[PDB]
Design a protein around this ligand. Structure first.
Ligand SMILES: Nc1nc(=O)c2nc(CNc3ccc(C(=O)N[C@@H](CCC(=O)O)C(=O)O)cc3)cnc2[nH]1
Ligand SMILES: [Mn+2]
Ligand SMILES: [Mn+2]
Ligand SMILES: [Mn+2]
Length: 157
């Protein structure tokens, strides 16, 4: 089962380009991806800098791999197969990779951040008749979190 996990600014802007400081969102991301395979695009891999620990890291790119610490694939179907038989595969972006996996996804984990950010890459426009919000948790900005944030889980319907 494929899930997407993303942090979205106002108007669904993604944002590689690091507009906020949300330690609570990083903990949410870690909690929801721990011990699951993660699929990412190459610019997201370069941003992270080093493999996410305790997780098979799969990079989807059309060009040959340049780091033996991660697994490199060239297609969606190869990326899924490289995950093996796990209960849940986590797709961690960026925008093009989210579009590649959205039609197969059954679950979205979204953090909505009340930040206006000039990026031009948007999360795909998921519609109500395909996606039922099943969990939401709102937080105000505080001394350790720069902006308000809202954790949402949606399930395909
Ligand atoms: N909700 C959410 N928040 C994000 O920041 C996020 N980021 C990406 C991809 N970008 C990144 C960038 C850094 C790390 C990262 O360094 N994660 C660490 C957290 C603490 C640490 O640095 O060790 C991890 O272990 O998961 C993950 C994803 C994709 N979906 C997201 N989804
Ligand atoms: Mn890019
Ligand atoms: Mn605002
Ligand atoms: Mn339906």
């Amino acid at each position: 089962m494929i899930s997407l996990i993303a942090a979205l600014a106002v108007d669904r802007v993604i944002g590689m380009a690091m507009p906020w400081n949300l330690p609570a969102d990083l903990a949410w991301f870690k909690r929801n991806t721990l011990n699951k395979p993660v699929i990412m695009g190459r610019h997201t891999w370069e941003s992270i800098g080093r493999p996410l620990p305790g997780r098979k890291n799969i990079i989807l790119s059309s060009q040959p791999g340049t780091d033996d610490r991660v697994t490199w694939v060239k297609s969606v179907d190869e990326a899924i197969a490289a995950c093996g038989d796990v209960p849940e595969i986590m797709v961690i972006g960026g925008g093009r990779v989210y579009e590649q996996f959205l039609p197969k996804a059954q679950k979205l984990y979204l953090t909505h951040i009340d930040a206006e950010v000039e990026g031009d890459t948007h999360f795909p426009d998921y519609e109500p008749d395909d996606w039922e919000s099943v969990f939401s948790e709102f937080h105000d900005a505080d001394a350790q979190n720069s902006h308000s944030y809202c954790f949402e889980i949606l399930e395909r319907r």
